């Protein structure tokens, strides 16, 4: 069943006991923290095989 | 505890796993802050059951 990704993330917040408005009022910060964290995986996997 | 939904002209709130539309009210919903902070907000009446009881 389709759902907008920001609304899906608001229900994944609501599922950990953090209220939905904490996503929608911080959505650009949360998106930038996720995009930044995926960049650290890419750099770490490129940096070492260990 | 639900999602906002529109049939094409009206706005309703439903439980997520089964379609059961309700009128939007100050009990089905909660407030946080002004309109300007939220990406993709929409404009609608939210009904208040106390107002007719004070008018009567
Ligand atoms: C939407 O809901 C209202 C209220 O039940 C109804 O009058 C209307 O015909 C429905 N359909 C559309 C497409 O607006
Ligand atoms: C929502 O309502 C306010 C007040 O009438 C208006 O300033 C604003 O432009 C409206 N926004 C949309 C998306 O229609």
From Swiss-Prot, chain B:
Glycans are attached at residues 7, 43. Subunit of the fusion protein that is processed upon entry into the host cell. Mediates fusion of the virion and cellular membranes by functioning as a class I viral fusion protein. Contains a viral fusion peptide that is unmasked after S2 cleavage. This cleavage can occur at the cell membrane by host TMPRSS2 or during endocytosis by host CSTL. In either case, this triggers an extensive and irreversible conformational change that leads to fusion of the viral envelope with the cellular cytoplasmic membrane, releasing viral genomic RNA into the host cell cytoplasm. This is Spike protein S2'. It comes from Severe acute respiratory syndrome coronavirus 2 (2019-nCoV). The chain holds residues 1092 to 1147 of 1273 of the full protein.
